[model samples]
Target: HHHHFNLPPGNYKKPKLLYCSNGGHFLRILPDGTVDGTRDRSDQHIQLQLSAESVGEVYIKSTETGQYLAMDTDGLLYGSQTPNEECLFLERLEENHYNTYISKKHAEKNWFVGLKKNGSCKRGPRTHYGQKAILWLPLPV
Candidate 1:
């Protein structure tokens, strides 16, 4: 966002807020080092470790759990101690309010951080329309 465009020496810091598009759920980085979307959010998830070389590229991580939001070969999301391309996200921001994140590592037009029918968070396509795309906002600070 227009917040802190320049990253410090480490180039990574937590985000202020995040929300899902489908459920309008809050993206939470929960305890036990897990990530998901729920109707509510807490300080635990509000502080997200965000690292970006530029606006188009970033890594979504958790400040509390010290894990990165990445996915597996089977198209599921999980927390990982390891940092890789799967953890990298491409920012597709719209207007001046919401943002959509796309995987820098996949190719289904590929996985947009989405939730499953059961309400658990998964990396799937909410891409048919802009409204369902994985949208997040920065807020906690």
Candidate 2:
């Protein structure tokens, strides 16, 4: 039935917060287009829009800045104004009920969206699927 692969419905109308398990921080996109992790659960720019595409692919957009979450070839994560191929991510729910987002545009590279224990952004090349740094829990707002 492919139930394990079942995903949240597309056209999600509300914003959600991505809580990092290892870092204990929420992902946020600053107005200046910087991607960071915050410990404040009530932070204004922490909520994001997950626009799902076919299968498990999605584009994360900042609700406040309106910038899309993108990963460059160098495996750096940032905010982009345009929804280009770099903005696409392969969203997967893991066995532990946490989510992992890998750069869909650079599938061969397997770059992951991750955060450090200090709540700083972790470079994609330095991440892996098994690391808690790259595991996230989606909290609806």
Candidate 3:
């Protein structure tokens, strides 16, 4: 069953224009710490432009599917509650896009979903630091 909740429609404020290599795009960072990007692209590298009070939260909704992933710029991966699972990280391939990898052991191909604002307390502190925004890519596609 799908759980549904209602949020007020957000007005289209001027998005902070983020340019990678090929084209430029826009995204709006809301006051409550939400990032929303609606511009479409066919390129490989995706650019992230930030423009809000504080780097609050980054939400990545799959282009193909509407699955939502959340990340913070602090480089923590959040949203997944499963035990001992790590969110995929993006390897910067070119200007704006990135390639993703699962652990060398895990056979399944992995892609980024998003990052978390706070590090996991239940799990130990993350091995990698200085990454605020979680990286969200694709899942084996």
What TM-score does candidate 2 get on C-alpha atoms?
A: 0.90
Off by over 4 Å in 1: 1-14, 95-97, 116-119, 125-129
Which of the predicted structures, 1 or 2, would earn the higher lDDT when compared with the native? 2
Instruction: Tell me the tens digit of each residue's lDDT in model 2 across 1-141.
Output: 212354443345778899997879999999888898999988999989997876788999999889999988788899999999999988877754678888887777667899999998888889875788988888887
- Candidate 3, lDDT over the whole model: 0.26
Residue 116's C-alpha lDDT in candidate 3?
32
Winning model by TM-score: 2
TM-scores, all candidates, are 0.72, 0.90, 0.20
Q: What TM-score would you give candidate 1 relative to the actual structure?
A: 0.72
Shift of residue 90 alpha carbon in model 3, Å = 17
lDDT at position 125, candidate 1: 51
Cα-based lDDT at residue 93, candidate 1: 54
Worst 10 residues of 2 by lDDT: 1-10
What is each predicted model's overall lDDT from 0 to 1? 0.62, 0.84, 0.26
Evaluation by TM-score, superior candidate among 1 and 2: 2
